[PDB]
Amino acid sequence: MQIRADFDSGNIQVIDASDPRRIRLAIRPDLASQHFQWFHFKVEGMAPATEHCFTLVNAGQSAYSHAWSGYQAVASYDGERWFRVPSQYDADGLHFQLEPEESEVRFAYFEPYSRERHARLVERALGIEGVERLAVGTSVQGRDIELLRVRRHPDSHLKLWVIAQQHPGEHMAEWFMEGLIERLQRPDDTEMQRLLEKADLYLVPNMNPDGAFHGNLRTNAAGQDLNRAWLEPSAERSPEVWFVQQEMKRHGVDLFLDIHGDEEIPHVFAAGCEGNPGYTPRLERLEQRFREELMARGEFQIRHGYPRSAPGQANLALACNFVGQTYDCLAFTIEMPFKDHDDNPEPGTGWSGARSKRLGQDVLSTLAVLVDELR
Ligand SMILES: N=C(N)NCCS[C@@H](CC(=O)O)C(=O)O
Ligand SMILES: [Zn+2]
Numbered sequence: 001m002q003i004r005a006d007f008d009s010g011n012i013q014v015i016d017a018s019d020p021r022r023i024r025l026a027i028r029p030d031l032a033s034q035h036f037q038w039f040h041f042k043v044e045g046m047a048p049a050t051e052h053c054f055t056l057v058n059a060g061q062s063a064y065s066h067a068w069s070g071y072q073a074v075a076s077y078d079g080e081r082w083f084r085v086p087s088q089y090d091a092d093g094l095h096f097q098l099e100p101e102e103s104e105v106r107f108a109y110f111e112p113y114s115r116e117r118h119a120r121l122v123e124r125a126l127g128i129e130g131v132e133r134l135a136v137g138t139s140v141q142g143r144d145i146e147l148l149r150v151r152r153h154p155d156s157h158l159k160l161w162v163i164a165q166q167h168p169g170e171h172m173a174e175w176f177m178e179g180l181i182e183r184l185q186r187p188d189d190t191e192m193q194r195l196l197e198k199a200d201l202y203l204v205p206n207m208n209p210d211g212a213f214h215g216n217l218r219t220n221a222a223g224q225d226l227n228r229a230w231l232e233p234s235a236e237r238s239p240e241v242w243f244v245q246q247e248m249k250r251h252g253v254d255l256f257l258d259i260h261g262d263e264e265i266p267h268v269f270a271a272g273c274e275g276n277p278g279y280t281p282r283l284e285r286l287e288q289r290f291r292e293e294l295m296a297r298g299e300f301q302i303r304h305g306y307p308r309s310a311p312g313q314a315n316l317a318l319a320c321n322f323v324g325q326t327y328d329c330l331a332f333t334i335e336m337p338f339k340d341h342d343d344n345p346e347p348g349t350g351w352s353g354a355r356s357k358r359l360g361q362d363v364l365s366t367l368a369v370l371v372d373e374l375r
Contacts, residue, residue: 005041008114009171011215012041020046021053027062030216032223037062037263038169040108040215043100051099054107059094063217067263068094071339072350074111077102082111084350110261110338111353113165113174115143115213118206121178122146125205128184134202137243140221143209145240147247150184150201158199158374160255160367163244166226166319167218168211170261172336172356177205177259179357183364195368202251207240227258228315230322241319253327254374257363258319259334266339267304268351268359270294270332271320275309278325286330286373293369298362299341299355306335330374334363 003025005012015024029036039056046052059068068089073096076082085107087096098105125131130152137145162180165173181203186192206212210221219225222237229238233245262269272287273279294300314321324331336359340350349355 001043001045001047003041003043005215007042008116008213009040009112009215010042011036011039015057017043020050023052023054024057025054026058027056028215030211030219030223031214031221033219033225035063035216035218037064037067038109038215038217040106040112042104042106044104046100046103046105048103049099051097053097054095055092056094057092059089060091064263067338070266071263072096072347073107074109074350075105075107076111077105079106082108082352083348109169110171110351111175113171113178113212113353115209117178118174118209121174121181121205122148125181125184128181130196131184135243135247137240139208139210139240140237141210143213145207145209145243146205147244148181148201148203148205150196150203152196156196156198156200158254158371159202159252160199160374161202161248161253161323162257162259163204163207163319164259165212166207166240166258167260168208168214168220169217171212172261172338172351172353173259174206175353175356176334176336176360177203178353179360180364181205182357183361191365191368195364195371198371199254199367199374202247204244207244227260227319228317230319231317248323248327253323254329255367256320256323256327256329256331257334258323258332260336261338262335263338265304265335266337266342268298268300268337268341269302269305269335270300271306271335272308273314273321273324273331275312275314276316276321276325277312277314278328279311280328283324283328283330286370287332289370289373290330290332290366294363294366297365298359299344300359300362301343330370334359
């Protein structure tokens with residue numbers, strides 16, 4: 001058989017694939033940083049009625065190695081239908097098995113979102129009523145960072161910002177954006193009519209095109225963790241973030257959602273700004289309102305997530321905290337799992353692109369209810 005990762009978001013190093021029950025592979029570190037966890041490769045020429053056993057030998061050295069426990073790898077014969085496969089984790093690494101029904105199959109850490117799909121999403125968005133490309137940034141390697149604006153009423157006053165995938169390996173993030181944008185196509189959507197009569201949406205489908213294309217997990221091309229560059233952005237080292245901050249300064253922000261994915265926690269959740277020195281009772285209540293309304297509508301919960309920050313101990317280098325404090329607006333880091341959303345088990349696919357898309361649509365419903373309370 002032959003294994004390769006010479007394509008968009010591909011990531012893998014082949015050690016030995018001469019024995020179907022002893023396939024050995026290694027995950028490749030980011031272009032310019034030590035991080036790694038995301039993997040994506042294709043296998044071709046597999047024999048029929050044959051059990052194939054894979055091992056990612058260096059999983060123990062990954063960025064979040066403790067997150068491998070309970071994680072099931074994703075696979076697909078066509079690149080459209082993705083399914084989970086039996087996986088285990090021990091000192092030897094991550095292992096997964098499959099008796100392929102076809103001669104070729106792909107494996108990935110999560111259902112991938114290619115830049116080609118990104119182009120299609122942008123093309124689709126600009127064909128929707130009220131949608132325009134407000135601005136465009138440039139990544140370290142010269143790829144577009146589109147900023148889309150949804151404005152259907154020339155007298156609205158609120159600016160709701162949603163950006164995604166600052167960390168390239170968190171592909172569920174742009175899937176979330178696809179769901180959000182596709183909902184805008186609906187001819188008769190009363191909730192969106194109400195929301196857009198009072199607010200415009202500022203959307204950034206992908207914050208790290210270089211990292212995504214190169215199959216990176218954490219950093220942009222220059223090796224910078226974009227979500228640690230908000231306190232001191234650079235047009236040279238973190239142009240992706242520098243771009244967004246300039247646009248925010250000019251248009252204003254009344255809501256900010258930073259879409260991410262968490263390797264360890266098998267639950268969808270949101271991390272707020274309770275650690276901000278600028279945190280206020282107003283924001284405390286708004287965060288409560290958002291979580292409650294979203295939990296009542298989508299696959300979202302509150303018990304599991306990151307620990308809350310002690311008063312005034314937040315790291316302002318993170319987008320959620322920086323934007324929330326700089327603009328005194330409701331702000332959250334939305335986190336979807338690489339595993340499953342255990343509250344609603346669907347083992348066959350675990351968390352997926354489709355469920356990510358749905359969460360995006362349910363978030364829109366939540367914003368529609370809270371619009372009059374944002375300011
Ligand atoms: N409150 C913290 N420290 N993180 C939550 C926001 S995103 C976070 C997790 C993620 O990357 O998904 C990160 O930027 O590392
Ligand atoms: Zn992230």
